[PDB]
Amino acid sequence: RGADFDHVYSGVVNLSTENIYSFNYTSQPDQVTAVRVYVNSSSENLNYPVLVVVRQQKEVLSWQVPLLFQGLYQRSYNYQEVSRTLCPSEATNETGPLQQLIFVDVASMAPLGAQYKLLVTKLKHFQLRTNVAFHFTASPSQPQYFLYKFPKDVDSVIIKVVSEMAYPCSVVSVQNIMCPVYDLDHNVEFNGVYQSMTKKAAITLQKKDFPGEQFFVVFVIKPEDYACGGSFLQRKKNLEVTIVPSIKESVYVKSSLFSVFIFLSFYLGCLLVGFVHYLRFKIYFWNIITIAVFYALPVIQLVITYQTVVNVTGNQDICYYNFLCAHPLGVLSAFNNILSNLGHVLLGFLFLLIVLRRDILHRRALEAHFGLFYAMGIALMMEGVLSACYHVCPNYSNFQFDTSFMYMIAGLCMLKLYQTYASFAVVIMVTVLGVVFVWFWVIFSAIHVLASLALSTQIYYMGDFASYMLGIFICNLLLYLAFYIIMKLRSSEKVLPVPLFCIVATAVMWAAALYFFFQNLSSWEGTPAESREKNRECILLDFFDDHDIWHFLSATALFFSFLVLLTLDDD
Amino acid sequence: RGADFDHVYSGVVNLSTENIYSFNYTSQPDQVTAVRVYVNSSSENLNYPVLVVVRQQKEVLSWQVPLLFQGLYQRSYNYQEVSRTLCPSEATNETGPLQQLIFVDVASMAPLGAQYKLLVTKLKHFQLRTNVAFHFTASPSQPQYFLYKFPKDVDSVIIKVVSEMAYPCSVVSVQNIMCPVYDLDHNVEFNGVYQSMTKKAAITLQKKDFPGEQFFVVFVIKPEDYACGGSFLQRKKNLEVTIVPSIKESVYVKSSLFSVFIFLSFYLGCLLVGFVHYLRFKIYFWNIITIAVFYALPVIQLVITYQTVVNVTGNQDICYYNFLCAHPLGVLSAFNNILSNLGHVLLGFLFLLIVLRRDILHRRALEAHFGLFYAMGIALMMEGVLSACYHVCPNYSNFQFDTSFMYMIAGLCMLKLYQTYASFAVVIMVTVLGVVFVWFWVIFSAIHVLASLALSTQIYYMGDFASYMLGIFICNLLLYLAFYIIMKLRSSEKVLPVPLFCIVATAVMWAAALYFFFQNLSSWEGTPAESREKNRECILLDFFDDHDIWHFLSATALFFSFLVLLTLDDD
Ligand SMILES: *[C@@H]1O[C@H](CO)[C@@H](O[C@@H]2O[C@H](CO)[C@@H](O[C@@H]3O[C@H](CO)[C@@H](O)[C@H](O)[C@@H]3O)[C@H](O)[C@H]2NC(C)=O)[C@H](O)[C@H]1NC(C)=O
Ligand SMILES: *[C@@H]1O[C@H](CO)[C@@H](O[C@@H]2O[C@H](CO)[C@@H](O[C@@H]3O[C@H](CO)[C@@H](O)[C@H](O)[C@@H]3O)[C@H](O)[C@H]2NC(C)=O)[C@H](O)[C@H]1NC(C)=O
Ligand SMILES: *[C@@H]1O[C@H](CO)[C@@H](O[C@@H]2O[C@H](CO)[C@@H](O[C@@H]3O[C@H](CO)[C@@H](O)[C@H](O)[C@@H]3O)[C@H](O)[C@H]2NC(C)=O)[C@H](O)[C@H]1NC(C)=O
Ligand SMILES: *[C@@H]1O[C@H](CO)[C@@H](O[C@@H]2O[C@H](CO)[C@@H](O[C@@H]3O[C@H](CO)[C@@H](O)[C@H](O)[C@@H]3O)[C@H](O)[C@H]2NC(C)=O)[C@H](O)[C@H]1NC(C)=O
Ligand SMILES: *[C@@H]1O[C@H](CO)[C@@H](O[C@@H]2O[C@H](CO)[C@@H](O)[C@H](O)[C@H]2NC(C)=O)[C@H](O)[C@H]1NC(C)=O
Ligand SMILES: *[C@@H]1O[C@H](CO)[C@@H](O[C@@H]2O[C@H](CO)[C@@H](O)[C@H](O)[C@H]2NC(C)=O)[C@H](O)[C@H]1NC(C)=O
Ligand SMILES: *[C@@H]1O[C@H](CO)[C@@H](O[C@@H]2O[C@H](CO)[C@@H](O)[C@H](O)[C@H]2NC(C)=O)[C@H](O)[C@H]1NC(C)=O
Ligand SMILES: *[C@@H]1O[C@H](CO)[C@@H](O[C@@H]2O[C@H](CO)[C@@H](O)[C@H](O)[C@H]2NC(C)=O)[C@H](O)[C@H]1NC(C)=O
Ligand SMILES: [Zn+2]
Ligand SMILES: [Zn+2]
């Protein structure tokens, strides 16, 4: 039967009859066209569904209406409206216009008869445009996919998908041109890069991965929200896809020089105040760096295999990146998260150089206190190193390594103190019970405030859970630095200007750094799709987000606070 | 057109014609029947394939002949013979016999005509039997699957699949009864437990996971061997599946008592030789166990998430178990690999008790050497602990943690020695270059023999890469123990019988343990399917394989060698 596009054909089919519709159209040698088939079925006899077969020249598609989805815990769903977009065949200049035939066979084995409505339309918005937002609606029975063609100048693009509602849970996938196109829930993650989303998604692609310099962007809606962060007629989802070009290679070399020349200006400070003085005229140390080298050896090998699993598969749900500001460089998918830790490592070498100069000049004056300062600058290096391997592929498992090492350092430091205790030990053991799981949480914060009071009093007599350590790192040291400002003012002592600049710089840097610490852009505490809802763009030279600025400012704030403790003893 | 089973129908189809065959049969209320459809296509015009649609009452299947597979690096394959087994509908006593209809629509859009051969048979060997080997042949275009029904007494089964040839690479999957059955390469790993095999495979199932107490065993042949350990008309594979019942709960409690009462008999030895004597009438220590606790904290959390990823998915290719002797217990998939390390931990507590008794009696005699012996017994505990967390889910990543810690211990021990060197340092750095990659390998073994000679000479003056450390652990200590046997014999010294029994027990235990060490049953150095080829059955009470016996004997051999070093100084 000859049939026309954009016309709703209705009919009744049963065991003896079988309706066959023939659709005839042509494809232009430059324009690319796609055909979408809509089938309805008002008959709710689930034992006798409507079987629809779509035949092309090189492909056959088949589905049953109403669609059935087997949910978890013995749940089933029906979908009376099923839609599908056929795989387009692109005509070139070498072939000219191409005539194409589509046969749509609608049949059923019902004894009485099943009603159905068939509508076949052409898609006028199949091809996506650069920097143009496109709005569309998808459904678990009605998947959608579109085509993007790479321009000649553009070498890498970012696909930004944004939705205003969290549910239903969706899947965005990028696939090749060659038919078939896997747009069903059981084969969408078979090949190509894919992501899971609730509100936001971001996929970064390169031109060299696709031989035709084009790809399909497949949008599949899941029938249940168990894979995302949730549970449980139609689950219609409104989406908005925008494809933007990535930054050029000049932004890479401009931001790399900013991350070096800022912290090399700190090296100019020591060589400038060392010129003022010209114008004014071990085994236990080596023991703490073999532990750090042998601790850091498996965690580099752990996250390298995490990165290569992501690269050779399409599973971008393993690493918890900030995908809106993840700029790749070769194997690394987020080079900006590694580059901002370079200044954190380097600045510790300046502090180790400063305490070396103080130790040699004290030993030279001895011819005519400095031990833990070496370990304080060593921990500045290794945490910047461990943050770099954490940011190769951030995950729930990798966070239990870069913080546990620092906890171990604190433990060994207490042993040295004891050489010249239980309330701090329950604190380490209460927080691992919260990993397992009203009575627990009222003492979870009660012992943390008591231990914060039990750190400040012992220093006074000597005169996530990592954020809770960082909570007391700001709170107790603010009073601990302020204890000798009022003690030296009351006694016969004066504050030199060189500590005075370092005290006021430590206060303003920790005020600025703690603001950027609370701007969480990702979280492994929930599902990977829930982590993507908090992603944000780059706010520094289109290369650094809020968390990468925190890596810069906490490097300065740790350095200036450590320089305060080296000073204030010149009287 | 009415058609009969077991008859090869041939025909020519083109654009105008479309052959439709109707197949009519009945299903018995106790016997379960399955229908297999074979389609050939001798026409090699790839632009106009033969499109076959199989319609049932509740399901529609469609495929094109010849089948096309898109390989890696732009490779394509054709398959002129395509076979498929339709999803069976089981008739019960409540429904009686059921009449069923199958329509097979064969069509093509070729202008001239395409030849095809259709054959539809019933399967007389669809249901599998317990403890009965079944032989069958599969192909990438001809997947096969069978049905197993759980007996009332059996609560858990093991599916043992064995093939005589490594290639082609195959996939074995276990799925639910409910249609559709995913037997294609793009959806076989969508749900249910699946495994990848080349020669052997073993899937362990429980009755409580399947609500119908039955399952489908799907066999899918991959078109390429890149997922397995290899590369690159038909790729026919001969397989053999046997379903065996698992061991009862009595074997669990019998083998658990064997692992305890053997090593508790070692505790009876100290309480027996302590009765003979009745008838004859710190801070640095605490520093080494906080490093071990903080090192062991993330690796338990690393492998627990590895186990839960395996459990909630079907991916059994992550953990490198010995699947022929992997006995689950709750969350753990291989409980026998955890249980054999219990005696390795416990036996170290006896050695720590022995050196405590020697230290107290020496201190009591002081009123009227023992430091590293505490650390030697501590490393006996922690390596048995670290082998247990390694065997929760063995992997390439987890091996770089349980060996690196021991390497770190050796490093810190050298610091104590230095307190009272470069050739040992290149050895640690050469072996990590072999992870990256003729000139390298001739010095890889040359520096290892030289360093083995450079360990023995320094002790003489005081009077995988983990297997290479274990290579010198046997070789250098054999001469190092033999150095004072000939020295005491030449000088005026006699060997007491209590060391003498311990020397001859150390030699026979290390001879027995090294035999079981070289029986490798798994290897993460290759693909997961290549690791499964070396799996073996349990050789000790149907609960312990060769590697679990190695955990028993090396625990005794380390204990008796450590007891030798405590003795031989009574003169
Ligand atoms: C496939 O064939 C078509 C048909 O010739 C090609 O389209 C043609 O492309 C050229 C190159 O850009 C166009 O010439 C340009 O025309 C504009 C005015 O439209 C003029 O301002 C430029 O200076 C230039 O001369 C040409 O107009 C265009 N033809 C049509 C009908 O639009 C197409 O490029 C071919 N594609 C491939 C991949 O070979
Ligand atoms: C299959 O059944 C569905 C659901 O009954 C049909 O979708 C419905 O289509 C009509 C006409 O396209 C929509 O009516 C229009 O709605 C808009 C927005 O409310 C309104 O501005 C218009 O004046 C008009 O009333 C209707 O909303 C829509 N229903 C839903 C739930 O989306 C569909 O057309 C049927 N046929 C096929 C081939 O899918
Ligand atoms: C579905 O209906 C069939 C038909 O009745 C049931 O098969 C029947 O099962 C009973 C129970 O085992 C059989 O009785 C046994 O017969 C053997 C001799 O064959 C005798 O030695 C035993 O002592 C016992 O009496 C009965 O023979 C068998 N009928 C036939 C025709 O084989 C079947 O159990 C029903 N299934 C369900 C799930 O209800
Ligand atoms: C589609 O084409 C294939 C391949 O041409 C056909 O398979 C062939 O089937 C014949 C008859 O079943 C087999 O011949 C028999 O071979 C055995 C073992 O060599 C021999 O003992 C017998 O005397 C007989 O000659 C033939 O081996 C087999 N070819 C292959 C490669 O397996 C198939 O029958 C065709 N039709 C369908 C519906 O699949
Ligand atoms: C449903 O099946 C019935 C028979 O099972 C068929 O009804 C026929 O409809 C055609 C025209 O639509 C006429 O020949 C008669 O009204 C019916 N013939 C017979 C022999 O029953 C038909 O296949 C289906 N009915 C529909 C679509 O209305
Ligand atoms: C699809 O429609 C086109 C018309 O748009 C048909 O093309 C016609 O074909 C006949 C015979 O081949 C010619 O005599 C006409 O001149 C063609 N029309 C045009 C506008 O070129 C085409 O045949 C149709 N497809 C099928 C399968 O019938
Ligand atoms: C291939 O297509 C041709 C037409 O394109 C058809 O050949 C017809 O075959 C039938 C019987 O097989 C007879 O009516 C004539 O021999 C042909 N008729 C016409 C109008 O050409 C047929 O569809 C196919 N040929 C086969 C299967 O042999
Ligand atoms: C499939 O075959 C069976 C026979 O094995 C057909 O059953 C017959 O149905 C007619 C009318 O319904 C009865 O008069 C006969 O007595 C039945 N035969 C038997 C042996 O019971 C059945 O109709 C066939 N299916 C179809 C769709 O025609
Ligand atoms: Zn960070
Ligand atoms: Zn082991």
Numbering used by the authors:
A (entry chain C), B (entry chain A): 44 to 275, 287 to 335, 442 to 528, 541 to 592, 605 to 621, 626 to 651, 708 to 815
Quote the study on this structure:
Two mammalian homologs of systemic RNA interference defective protein 1 (SID-1) (SIDT1/2) are suggested to function as double-stranded RNA (dsRNA) transporters for extracellular dsRNA uptake or for release of incorporated dsRNA from lysosome to cytoplasm. Here, we determine the cryo-electron microscopy structures of human SIDT1, homodimer in a side-by-side arrangement, with two distinct conformations, the cholesterol-bound form and the unbound form. Our structures reveal that the membrane-spanning region of SIDT1 harbors conserved histidine and aspartate residues coordinating to putative zinc ion, in a structurally similar manner to alkaline ceramidases or adiponectin receptors that require zinc for ceramidase activity. We identify that SIDT1 has a ceramidase activity that is attenuated by cholesterol binding.
